[PDB]
Structures are given as C-alpha cells and as structure tokens.
C-alpha cells in the first residue's frame, strides 16, 4: 500500500474521536478534550488490532484446501 | 443427468445389524428410533467427489528372475543421511552363516554363469533354468487358503506340479478355489496356458512353511508393507510387532 492509506485511516480515526468526544457535547477545547482524544485513539488502535486478529483468524480458519501439513 | 431433488426421504436399513440384537440402528439425539431421514441437496451446480478407493491390497509382483549385472556390497546408510553406516559383501558359509566373503563375488557369479558342470541325474532343485523367480508365495501348511484366481489380459493357468493343482485364471471369472497343503515345502511351477511371448518363462514359486514361519514372514515383510504409515521400522514395523500378536 501507500502512506495515503494511512492518512485516510488517520482521518477516519480523527472523525471517530471527534464523534466520541464532541458528538453530543459541543463545548470548548481543552487539555481534557486532548486527553479524551488520546484515550479514544488508544482504544481505536486496540480495537483495530483485535479486529484484524479476529478477521485474519476467521478468514484463516475457513478451509480452502486439503490439510497437507507436509 | 437431470439434477438432485431438493429433498429426499430415506428409510434407514432395518435388521442389517445383529451384533446386540438391536434392529434399530439409527437413533436421533432425542433417543427415539429414527425410522425416516431427510436428505437435502445444498449446491445445485456442484459436482460429487468420486468414492474413495477403500481397498488396500498388499501386492506381491511375482515375475521371472533376472540376471545379475554386478555383485554390489551391502551398504547401509546412516540415520536420509546417505553416508554409509555399514558396508560389506557377505557370503552364506556351509554352516549357514553369513560370514565375510573373501573372494570376488562378481568373479564367482561370472564364472558360475560361464561354465557349470552337469550330471546325468542332477536334481531339478539343484538345476533351475526357467524356474527361478523373484518372490515366492509364502503360506502356512495344513490350512484352508482360498485363492481368487483371475486373469488380466488372457486366460492363464497356474499349475503347481508338486501340489498337483491347476488353477485356470480367466478374465472376468473370479474362480474361488480352495488350497490345503498337507505338508510344508517349496514347489516350482510354470504357466499351463500358453500366455503369449512369455509362455515359456512365467515361473511361480510357492513356499508353505510352519505357521510360526509364515507368521514371521508376514510380520517381517507383509505386516511392514501395506501399513499406510511412516516407512520407519520403529514407527510401523515394531509398531506392528507392538500392535498385532497371535
């Protein structure tokens, strides 16, 4: 892939963090908002890692050829 | 042709099993005797995998004995680690001892082939010219062995003269013939039917031995073969010697 994919993912994560912080609470920005955004980013990274692991496993678990195992 | 019907109703066979006098073979998870079963077709366009050839027959290919080119030395490899763990050229001494051959075995074989003296009453057991074969059918004595005789191409005839038997293996005909050897011995025979080009040399060797000896041969060469496992002796052969006992 290219870094543009990472940029798009970052933009999506930023939109998600804004929704999580200011989706229903439209207030002034502060260090509390920054910390909330950092926590949301950490949670998003963990969720992405878990989703990738589970999806790769389920897609890796689905049989596609006879088990050879050499 | 056509297609698989979406749903089919099948009645499971009744009375097929009499192991425990339980004529009800199929019982659902509810425990009720399952008399009818519904078989549904899933993929309309999918084909069907061919039935697995469940038959595994230990094949001994009895062919005519061939001339030896050069006497090779018995080379055993390490461990597949082709390094020669063991090397030698044995010779069966008069005491039936596989001692170390001190002469040139190739020279001995070549000289024997070049010139062998003959006698007016030389035993046929000591003079085999069109009766030597690679493998001999190893069987026990004083027992009933059924032989299913069959031909692959044309009707051949296996005639054991010492046993006085003559089985005509013909195509299509699975001739189930009994054999009871009331004595332990080794017998030689040839094709009693003109088989074509090799109607002269189609030797058959039959060795009937004590049941202990037949079992030993089976355990050392037959049990090891047709195992469908790793070819290691400690993995199959000993395993067979640890799995099967009479």
């Amino acid at each position: 892939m290219d870094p543009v994919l990472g940029d798009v993912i970052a933009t999506r994560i930023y939109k998600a963090c804004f929704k999580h912080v200011y989706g229903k609470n439209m207030k002034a920005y502060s260090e509390k908002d920054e910390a909330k955004f950092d926590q949301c980013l950490t949670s998003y990274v963990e969720s992405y890692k878990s989703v990738t692991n589970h999806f790769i496993t389920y897609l890796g678990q689905l049989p596609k050829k006879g088990l050879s195992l050499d | 042709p056509g297609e698989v019907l979406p749903l089919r109703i099948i009645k499971y066979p009744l009375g097929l099993e009499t192991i425990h006098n339980n004529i009800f073979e199929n019982t659902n998870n509810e425990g009720n005797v399952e008399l009818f079963r519904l078989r549904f077709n899933s993929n309309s366009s999918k084909m069907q995998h061919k039935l697995v050839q469940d038959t595994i027959y230990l094949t001994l290919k009895q062919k005519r004995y061939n001339r030896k080119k050069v006497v090779a030395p018995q080379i055993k490899y390490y461990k597949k680690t082709d390094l020669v763990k063991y090397t030698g050229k044995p010779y069966l001494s008069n005491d039936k001892l596989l001692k170390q051959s001190i002469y040139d075995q190739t020279t001995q074989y070549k000289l024997i082939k070049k010139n062998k003296k003959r006698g007016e009453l030389i035993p046929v057991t000591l003079a085999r010219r069109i009766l030597r074969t690679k493998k001999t059918l190893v069987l026990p004595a004083h027992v009933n062995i059924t032989l299913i005789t069959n031909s692959y191409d044309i009707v051949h005839s296996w005639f054991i003269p010492g046993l006085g038997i003559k089985l005509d293996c013909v195509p299509g005909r699975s001739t189930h013939h009994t054999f009871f050897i009331d004595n332990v011995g080794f017998y030689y025979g040839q094709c009693a039917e003109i088989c074509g080009r090799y109607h002269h040399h189609m030797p058959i060797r039959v060795c009937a031995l004590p049941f202990e000896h037949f079992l030993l041969w089976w355990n050392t060469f037959g049990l090891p073969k047709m195992l469908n496992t790793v070819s290691r002796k400690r993995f199959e052969t000993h395993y067979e010697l640890r799995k099967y006992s009479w």
């Binding site: 049989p63 088990l67 | 005797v33 399952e34 009818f36 519904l38 549904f40 309309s44 366009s45 999918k46």
Partner: protein, 129 residues
C-alpha cells in the same frame, strides 16, 4: 492438537480432516447446463428436521415395544409412502420455485402437512398395530 500428536496420530488427523473436507474441493467444478435451483433455507431444514424428530418420538414407543422386524418394516413402509407423497409434492413445488418467498411457502406447507395430517395417519397406524 496436531503438534501434540505423534507421526501416526498426526497422519490420522490429516486423514480425517481431508476425508471430511472433500466437498470443499468438490465445490470447485460445476456443470453449466444444469438447471440451477435455489437451495432450501437452513431454517426450513431445521423445521423439517424438528417435524421428523417429533414423528420419530411418536414412533419410539411402538417401534421399541414391537418384537417383529416385519411389523416394524410395515409401519415404516406405510409412513414412508405417505411422507413420500407429501415430500414429492414439496419437492415439485421447490424445483419450480422462483423466489425465496416461494421456497418458504413450500417449506411451511410441507411442515404443516407433516404436523397436521401425518400425525393423524401415524396415530391411526399405531392404534391398528
């Protein structure tokens, strides 16, 4: 697991997996000329299996108590003829079905037929035998 097995046991596990996974390989090759039929839904299969299980549960007392293989086979044959007529009607509706709505309707009709009239037929047969 596989790493916890010896050579023979690993070979046996591979044998079982391959023999069970044949259809997946058979999922590859298809013949175009065949008239494609929409498969019956898993819910419909489950409902039909439940109806068959109810029928088997009903049969269980008479089947277990009977001491005649001939009588068991006769009861099974009568029930099989009736259910075979019903299933033939259902399959005829299924083959010509053009939509999942038609598939569901045919499945519901077959299940109701097994539920309603087949029960009376089985009850009468059991009362006779």
């Amino acid at each position: 697991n596989v790493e916890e097995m010896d050579t023979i046991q690993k070979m046996n596990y591979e044998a079982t997996v391959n023999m069970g996974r044949q259809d997946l390989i058979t999922r590859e090759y298809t013949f175009y000329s065949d008239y494609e039929f929409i498969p019956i839904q898993e819910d419909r299969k489950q409902q039909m299996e439940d109806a068959l299980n109810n029928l088997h549960k009903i049969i269980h007392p008479t089947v277990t108590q009977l001491k005649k293989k001939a009588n068991v086979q006769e009861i099974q044959d009568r029930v099989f003829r009736k259910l075979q007529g019903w299933e033939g009607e259902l399959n005829t509706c299924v083959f010509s079905a053009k939509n999942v709505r038609d598939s569901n309707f045919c499945a519901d009709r077959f299940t109701n037929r097994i539920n309603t009239e087949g029960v009376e037929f089985v009850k009468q047969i059991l009362r006779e035998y």
